[PDB]
Write a protein that binds this ligand. Sequence first.
Ligand SMILES: CO[C@H]1O[C@H](Cn2cc(CSC[C@H]3O[C@@H](S[C@@H]4O[C@H](CO)[C@H](O)[C@H](O)[C@H]4O)[C@H](O)[C@@H](O)[C@@H]3O)nn2)[C@@H](O)[C@H](O)[C@H]1O
Ligand SMILES: CO[C@H]1O[C@H](Cn2cc(CSC[C@H]3O[C@@H](S[C@@H]4O[C@H](CO)[C@H](O)[C@H](O)[C@H]4O)[C@H](O)[C@@H](O)[C@@H]3O)nn2)[C@@H](O)[C@H](O)[C@H]1O
Ligand SMILES: CO[C@H]1O[C@H](Cn2cc(CSC[C@H]3O[C@@H](S[C@@H]4O[C@H](CO)[C@H](O)[C@H](O)[C@H]4O)[C@H](O)[C@@H](O)[C@@H]3O)nn2)[C@@H](O)[C@H](O)[C@H]1O
Ligand SMILES: CO[C@H]1O[C@H](Cn2cc(CSC[C@H]3O[C@@H](S[C@@H]4O[C@H](CO)[C@H](O)[C@H](O)[C@H]4O)[C@H](O)[C@@H](O)[C@@H]3O)nn2)[C@@H](O)[C@H](O)[C@H]1O
Ligand SMILES: [Ca+2]
Ligand SMILES: [Ca+2]
Ligand SMILES: [Ca+2]
Ligand SMILES: [Ca+2]
Ligand SMILES: [Mn+2]
Ligand SMILES: [Mn+2]
Ligand SMILES: [Mn+2]
Ligand SMILES: [Mn+2]
Lengths: 232, 232, 232, 232
Amino acid sequence: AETVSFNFNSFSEGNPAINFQGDVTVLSNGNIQLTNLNKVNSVGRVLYAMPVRIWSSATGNVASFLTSFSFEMKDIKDYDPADGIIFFIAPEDTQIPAGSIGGGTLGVSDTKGAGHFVGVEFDTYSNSEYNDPPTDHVGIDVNSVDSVKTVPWNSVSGAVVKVTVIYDSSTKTLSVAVTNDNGDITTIAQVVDLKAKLPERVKFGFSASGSLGGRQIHLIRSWSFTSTLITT
Amino acid sequence: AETVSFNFNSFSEGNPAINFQGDVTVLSNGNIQLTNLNKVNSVGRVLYAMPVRIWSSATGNVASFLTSFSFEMKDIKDYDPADGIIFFIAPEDTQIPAGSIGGGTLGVSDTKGAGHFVGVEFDTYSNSEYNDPPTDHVGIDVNSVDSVKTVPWNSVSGAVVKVTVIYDSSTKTLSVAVTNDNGDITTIAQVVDLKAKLPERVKFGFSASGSLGGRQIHLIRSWSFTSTLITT
Amino acid sequence: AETVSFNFNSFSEGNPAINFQGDVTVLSNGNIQLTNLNKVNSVGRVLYAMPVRIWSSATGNVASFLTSFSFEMKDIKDYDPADGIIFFIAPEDTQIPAGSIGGGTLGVSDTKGAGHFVGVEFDTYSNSEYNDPPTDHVGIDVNSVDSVKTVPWNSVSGAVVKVTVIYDSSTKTLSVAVTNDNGDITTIAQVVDLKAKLPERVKFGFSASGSLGGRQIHLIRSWSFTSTLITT
Amino acid sequence: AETVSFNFNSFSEGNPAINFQGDVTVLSNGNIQLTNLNKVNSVGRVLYAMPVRIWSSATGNVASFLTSFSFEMKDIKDYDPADGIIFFIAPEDTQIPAGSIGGGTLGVSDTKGAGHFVGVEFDTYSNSEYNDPPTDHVGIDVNSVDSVKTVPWNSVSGAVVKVTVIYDSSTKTLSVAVTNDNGDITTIAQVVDLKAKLPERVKFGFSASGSLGGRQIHLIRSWSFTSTLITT
Ligand SMILES: CO[C@H]1O[C@H](Cn2cc(CSC[C@H]3O[C@@H](S[C@@H]4O[C@H](CO)[C@H](O)[C@H](O)[C@H]4O)[C@H](O)[C@@H](O)[C@@H]3O)nn2)[C@@H](O)[C@H](O)[C@H]1O
Ligand SMILES: CO[C@H]1O[C@H](Cn2cc(CSC[C@H]3O[C@@H](S[C@@H]4O[C@H](CO)[C@H](O)[C@H](O)[C@H]4O)[C@H](O)[C@@H](O)[C@@H]3O)nn2)[C@@H](O)[C@H](O)[C@H]1O
Ligand SMILES: CO[C@H]1O[C@H](Cn2cc(CSC[C@H]3O[C@@H](S[C@@H]4O[C@H](CO)[C@H](O)[C@H](O)[C@H]4O)[C@H](O)[C@@H](O)[C@@H]3O)nn2)[C@@H](O)[C@H](O)[C@H]1O
Ligand SMILES: CO[C@H]1O[C@H](Cn2cc(CSC[C@H]3O[C@@H](S[C@@H]4O[C@H](CO)[C@H](O)[C@H](O)[C@H]4O)[C@H](O)[C@@H](O)[C@@H]3O)nn2)[C@@H](O)[C@H](O)[C@H]1O
Ligand SMILES: [Ca+2]
Ligand SMILES: [Ca+2]
Ligand SMILES: [Ca+2]
Ligand SMILES: [Ca+2]
Ligand SMILES: [Mn+2]
Ligand SMILES: [Mn+2]
Ligand SMILES: [Mn+2]
Ligand SMILES: [Mn+2]
């Protein structure tokens, strides 16, 4: 079997293992800050630099994966706390969309909300243009920020949030468990055919964005991942 | 919302949070040993002592849960390494079945392989009488040790195994990710309607068994659990 | 180490984590109302259902704990605002004393004011029979509603009160900080040997009572608790 | 009564309510980082800018207080994670000791470990010169980093730690409860006569230090405080 495994307890600027895109910076404490608090339509993304083979064209086999990460969103004075973080999967050549308006696009889609990715968004602003539910939510996205499915959630300013994701290749199920500060868990699951929506090799990572009036601290604190593709 | 949250980094006798059933002992290192290596058809089970309200007849709501545990199975001289461990959910009055033959029943079912439980088994012996697959396997069990679904797996003697389980109440999906010693991940997922198969109040735990010729060390090393029920 | 931890942001009927005793009800907003406003000598108590092992006869070790809760007392028309709330610790078999007169006994003691418990009372009626100070007071109680120590306090009708309690096992100190509506803090601390006054296994909870002419709303709004016992 | 009350969910270097001393910086995420990771014998301290009157030469009365704060210590590559954080109380003219060697002094004492302060240290290095216990520990310090009392503790890299402190003026007891990431609680309490050891007006704050080979990330995430002095 073919296994990709890594663990980040902290992150650093001089690390070739991470691709830094756009407005992302690494703080002295080791956290990744995705957006620039002084920039209009700020977009920042991080990707695990090695492409991951999620399916084989030879066997037709699809990989399963288990991933865990921790993040924090914090309100800043005079700005609407927006727009949120998306944990995404995309083709290995993925870049911030050209002329990205940030905001509701979460740095992965065009103005109409379309792109080439599969993601788990932690959405803190209701964009009517992307049919967002009225409150903070966790969504499962397939090539669109107009989520296939959402669950109500609450983004607590300055709270450390823990996420666990399981992709089961046999049932094609993407399952997410989110652990809040008040200790409650929020879950969301959706059948997503990764072999049909994404290429053989993909990159995994995080994206966040803001607009002129919508900005907040988006921090990635830790990330562990394991994928296993059966090679028989 | 109604949340049950606990964490065991180790265990101890006299801890009122744990119900000990049958042949279970607590080792000096804090590990729970489920079976007695000198007993024929040994059965040992541990349960979280407090009943958990997994669903409500008033709202129709079903809880979601995130749980993680680590276990170890070790071969002993002469005996066939058997029979395995099951992480199970059952009515709050659950007891080892009367006249239990241990073995392939994994301490949760009768001789015909039937019982009242939902479980995730880590099965190390192929029982043709319960239509077991030919190799070691992880199974999803619904009132029977004749699994609704299995996945090939490999039980490595003396290896510490990590498990993560997500139950998403909205899709009724039970998703399991198993992390082996060699670094590979094994997953299995099944739609299981807990509200249809179990009562409102349940107990969560682990069970293991052996026969005359089939015996091995079955150890529970750690257990964390969070369940949330929407109260509306 | 052996740790018991929980956090209630709200409450619900049928939650098996909570034992309801006497006249307790759960309001639609999630608050617990301890007494029945239409009953003479009303007594209501809530207990965390799982026993907590506060000390071990084998090691001689005593647990430390940290707990925080919020409550509200509100006057009702015609009745004298009485009698108050007690946060208490008692043997795991604890029940409302048989033939309880409610009132100044706070639902934990007999008519002479004696019982088997350790508590922190938020007393709103001066019972000369229990040597109560002349004004509202916070008291530390050891097997009696005739407090070992009190501090003057003021119970404001309809005000949300926040309490924090620390028990340090090494010094045997029970420390209490009460945050009033006007922003001031009230503290009270007393050396209490829990190992000498209580059994190994105990229950934690809240009790409130009233009399014929002494009735008020007694509400428990939230409760978080963590205890840790050092094990062999 | 005289009450001082404040709450910090985030900190800014610009704000006048806080005094910055030495190598302290404010990160864009709002956290205070006490030491400079690239400096030998780095010392950084923070203080609530307004002096708080803890006792009165007119009445003899001593204030009680309740304070809560959260911190994080994180390991850095190639350096020994040292030396720790101290929550301290000192005269209003307090400054980093002249020619401070950082290290085991925690930025509050001279080379011999003496100074003018009362503190709660979260010590991560064993300095035999200050009679430190062999493991990580929480200590209560009175004019010395040779603690009046310590309790074994464990500093987990990248873990958010919650602390609650109660000072009860009547018993002169300083009680501390520390909530770890593994869920366990650590407590320590000591009788400290603040009137005898400190002036009437004092400053409250945090200090951290490192040395040549001993460095780590020291972060203050939040801080709440309330003190009440009886003026009758
Ligand atoms: C008739 O057709 C023409 O005229 C249209 C008329 N129009 C448009 C408008 C106002 S547009 C809505 C508001 O939106 C925010 S952006 C928003 O901020 C959030 C944080 O609060 C989040 O970050 C979120 O993600 C992000 O999207 C702006 O800043 C603000 O100024 C503006 O009022 N008012 N009139 C125009 O649309 C057409 O193109 C053009 O052809
Ligand atoms: C015609 O009908 C009558 O005769 C039947 C005839 N029978 C039965 C048998 C042999 S039964 C199979 C073997 O099984 C193991 S048990 C096994 O060990 C594993 C570890 O290796 C695992 O732990 C596993 O979980 C556990 O099940 C025994 O120990 C061993 O001795 C035995 O040969 N041989 N003939 C009988 O069935 C009927 O009731 C009766 O009416
Ligand atoms: C000589 O000996 C005999 O005669 C005694 C004579 N007695 C007794 C009395 C009056 S007893 C005091 C008053 O008390 C309240 S109860 C009170 O209400 C509060 C709210 O306002 C709080 O809730 C508080 O906690 C609760 O206690 C009653 O309702 C009220 O009617 C009554 O006047 N008057 N005479 C009797 O004691 C002896 O047993 C008997 O042998
Ligand atoms: C005979 O008398 C003369 O000779 C003495 C002889 N000496 C001294 C020494 C070695 S001194 C001990 C070691 O200490 C660390 S500092 C330490 O780092 C920690 C992180 O790991 C923490 O941060 C902690 O807080 C901090 O204290 C240094 O970096 C390292 O190089 C050094 O070996 N070796 N010989 C000298 O003492 C006298 O003054 C002088 O008169
Ligand atoms: Ca949005
Ligand atoms: Ca089997
Ligand atoms: Ca009274
Ligand atoms: Ca030290
Ligand atoms: Mn959305
Ligand atoms: Mn099986
Ligand atoms: Mn009283
Ligand atoms: Mn020390």
